[PDB]
Amino acid sequence: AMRQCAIYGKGGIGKSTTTQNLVAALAEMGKKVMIVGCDPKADSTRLILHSKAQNTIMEMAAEAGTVEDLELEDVLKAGYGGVKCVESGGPEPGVGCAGRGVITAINFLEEEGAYEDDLDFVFYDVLGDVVCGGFAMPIRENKAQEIYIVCSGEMMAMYAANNISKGIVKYANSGSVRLGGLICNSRNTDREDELIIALANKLGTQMIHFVPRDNVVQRAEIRRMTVIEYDPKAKQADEYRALARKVVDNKLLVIPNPITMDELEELLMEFG
Amino acid sequence: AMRQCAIYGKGGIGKSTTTQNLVAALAEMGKKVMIVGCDPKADSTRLILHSKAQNTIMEMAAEAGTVEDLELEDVLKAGYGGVKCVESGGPEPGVGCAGRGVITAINFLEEEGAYEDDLDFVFYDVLGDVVCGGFAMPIRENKAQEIYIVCSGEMMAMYAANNISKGIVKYANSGSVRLGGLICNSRNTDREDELIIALANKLGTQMIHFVPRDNVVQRAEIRRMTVIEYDPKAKQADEYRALARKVVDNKLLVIPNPITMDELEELLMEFG
Numbered sequence: 001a002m003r004q005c006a007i008y009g010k011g012g013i014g015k016s017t018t019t020q021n022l023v024a025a026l027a028e029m030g031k032k033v034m035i036v037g038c039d040p041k042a043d044s045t046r047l048i049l050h051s052k053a054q055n056t057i058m059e060m061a062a063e064a065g066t067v068e069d070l071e072l073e074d075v076l077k078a079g080y081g082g083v084k085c086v087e088s089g090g091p092e093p094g095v096g097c098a099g100r101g102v103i104t105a106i107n108f109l110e111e112e113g114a115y116e117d118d119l120d121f122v123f124y125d126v127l128g129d130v131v132c133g134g135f136a137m138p139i140r141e142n143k144a145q146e147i148y149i150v151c152s153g154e155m156m157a158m159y160a161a162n163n164i165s166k167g168i169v170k171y172a173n174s175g176s177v178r179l180g181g182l183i184c185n186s187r188n189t190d191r192e193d194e195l196i197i198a199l200a201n202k203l204g205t206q207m208i209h210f211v212p213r214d215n216v217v218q219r220a221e222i223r224r225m226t227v228i229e230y231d232p233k234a235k236q237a238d239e240y241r242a243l244a245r246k247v248v249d250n251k252l253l254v255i256p257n258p259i260t261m262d263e264l265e266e267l268l269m270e271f272g
Numbered sequence: 273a274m275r276q277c278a279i280y281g282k283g284g285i286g287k288s289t290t291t292q293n294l295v296a297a298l299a300e301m302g303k304k305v306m307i308v309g310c311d312p313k314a315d316s317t318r319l320i321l322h323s324k325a326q327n328t329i330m331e332m333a334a335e336a337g338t339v340e341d342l343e344l345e346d347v348l349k350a351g352y353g354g355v356k357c358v359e360s361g362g363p364e365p366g367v368g369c370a371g372r373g374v375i376t377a378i379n380f381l382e383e384e385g386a387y388e389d390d391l392d393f394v395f396y397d398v399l400g401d402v403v404c405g406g407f408a409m410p411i412r413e414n415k416a417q418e419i420y421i422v423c424s425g426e427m428m429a430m431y432a433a434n435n436i437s438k439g440i441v442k443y444a445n446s447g448s449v450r451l452g453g454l455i456c457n458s459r460n461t462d463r464e465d466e467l468i469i470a471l472a473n474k475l476g477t478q479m480i481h482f483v484p485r486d487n488v489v490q491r492a493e494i495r496r497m498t499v500i501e502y503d504p505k506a507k508q509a510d511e512y513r514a515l516a517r518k519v520v521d522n523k524l525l526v527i528p529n530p531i532t533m534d535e536l537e538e539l540l541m542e543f544g
């Protein structure tokens with residue numbers, strides 16, 4: 001068995017930083033993990049690979065002719081801790097559906113046997129500002145059973161969490177996609193942990209971890225590394241280790257209860 | 273003649289707040305303006321209408337039967353300063369293309385004669401995290417000749433500005449869509465104005481205004497108003513009046529020069 005997890009959230013909220021650090025901590029623990037980038041920015045694996053980014057399946061298929069001319073060993077790359085990494089890519093802005101590459105990538109990985117038995121986890125890093133096309137496919141097509149949403153006390157980030165939850169509810173009659181929890185990626189604001197706990201309770205889930213805002217993240221990323229690799233003694237490294245432990249141990253996977261805009265505004269008013 | 277302007281940028285960056293305050297200042301000046309919401313959040317007109325939000329063309333067409341059973345007077349609503357307001361709407365998350373409502377709305381407004389002669393400005397408030405489907409239509413179909421991008425020193429916000437610029441370049445052979453400028457919506461960080469000026473110069477455009485971070489915005493929005501209406505003496509009100517003056521006077525409309533990720537990272541490193 002392997003656990004298939006997807007990380008969703010609004011742009012810039014910390015999906016790729018949180019996912020790569022979480023995965024590095026899992027690898028440090030002895031888990032075998034694959035990361036599948038499903039965001040057109042295509043930098044979801046750079047901290048594992050010590051790289052600028054990673055060439056995408058869409059790009060490589062075009063240079064090779066067809067996706068069938070690609071071999072899995074050409075596309076998957078291993079980095080820190082043996083973590084395996086792949087990027088979907090997507091069409092250029094203004095041309096075709098921004099999520100089309102996700103569909104091509106996941107189908108390629110399935111057919112080519114990337115989901116081999118001794119993997120323990122797969123993480124999809126998915127754009128969540130819209131829930132449609134290839135960005136909805138992990139939910140619609142039952143690819144990621146456990147959704148974790150990165151958010152913050154920012155109104156827009158909480159709105160995005162509610163919108164992703166509505167997409168999970170829409171496909172609850174088929175497959176087994178469920179909400180696993182919220183991850184608060186702090187803006188360094190007072191009572192922010194309590195605010196995201198309250199939001200999670202209203203949705204029917206939990207805040208799995210509160211990730212502090214810490215400048216060591218930027219110092220690690222300037223050097224193309226996770227904090228786990230860059231400074232294993234950092235306080236922030238222990239934060240990602242705690243998040244990883246709680247993801248491993250999590251057993252609460254729910255069909256969420258989306259809230260109204262009045263409820264969301266009341267949350268923000270109350271917690272000041 | 274009327275000037276057709278579209279405001280793009282990443283989610284949560286300040287498109288709707290900046291657009292509604294800019295438009296209120298234009299109305300205070302004596303201009304006749306229409307706002308067309310092109311973001312599924314559908315709260316792009318609430319500060320003009322003193323409202324929770326606005327019912328969308330997609331919603332109203334469904335309750336009425338077809339979009340042809342709607343009359344323009346049923347859909348357009350006037351608020352502060354006589355500003356006319358309409359919301360496109362969009363499908364629920366996980367269902368169909370998130371931008372589909374934009375196409376329906378703009379076509380409805382054109383056919384029903386909303387673009388009547390004594391309008392001076394139309395502003396489209398457009399989601400910019402992806403540039404595809406209905407969100408690309410204002411560019412692809414030559415609906416907004418002047419694009420203004422709201423951004424900040426946030427890496428993701430600058431990436432979004434570069435991605436929108438790539439979409440403008442893609443359709444430069446047809447129509448007349450051009451980049452009009454960047455609007456910096458401050459995160460209260462040092463040298464941020466200089467950073468966005470430098471980005472604008474690299475793209476070939478200009479920073480049209482630096483909007484400060486000011487808590488009066490939240491106090492006005494809790495009361496469902498623009499700062500222009502809520503406190504006409506506020507320093508922030510004069511900021512939006514300066515932005516409005518510069519938009520009116522702007523004559524620089526360019527085909528932008530998108531930059532590479534290395535250039536974008538070098539900008540951030542340099543300005544610290």
Ligand SMILES: Nc1ncnc2c1ncn2[C@@H]1O[C@H](COP(=O)(O)OP(=O)(O)O)[C@@H](O)[C@H]1O
Nearest residue numbers: 011012013014015016017018211212213214217
């Ligand atoms: N806990 C944190 N502390 C400090 N900086 C962070 C933290 N999480 C993310 N960042 C920074 O925020 C920016 C955006 O994070 P990223 O993971 O790229 O967002 P997304 O993938 O959701 O667009 C990056 O520059 C990253 O270094």
Ligand SMILES: Nc1ncnc2c1ncn2[C@@H]1O[C@H](COP(=O)(O)OP(=O)(O)O)[C@@H](O)[C@H]1O
Nearest residue numbers: 283284285286287288289290483484485486489
């Ligand atoms: N200059 C500013 N100062 C203070 N708060 C702001 C400013 N601009 C925007 N905001 C706040 O930022 C949040 C997001 O702005 P909004 O216009 O809704 O973003 P978008 O439409 O781009 O998603 C809102 O709560 C708004 O009140």
Ligand SMILES: [Mg+2]
Nearest residue numbers: 015016039044
């Ligand atoms: Mg990312």
Ligand SMILES: [Mg+2]
Nearest residue numbers: 287288311316
């Ligand atoms: Mg908005």
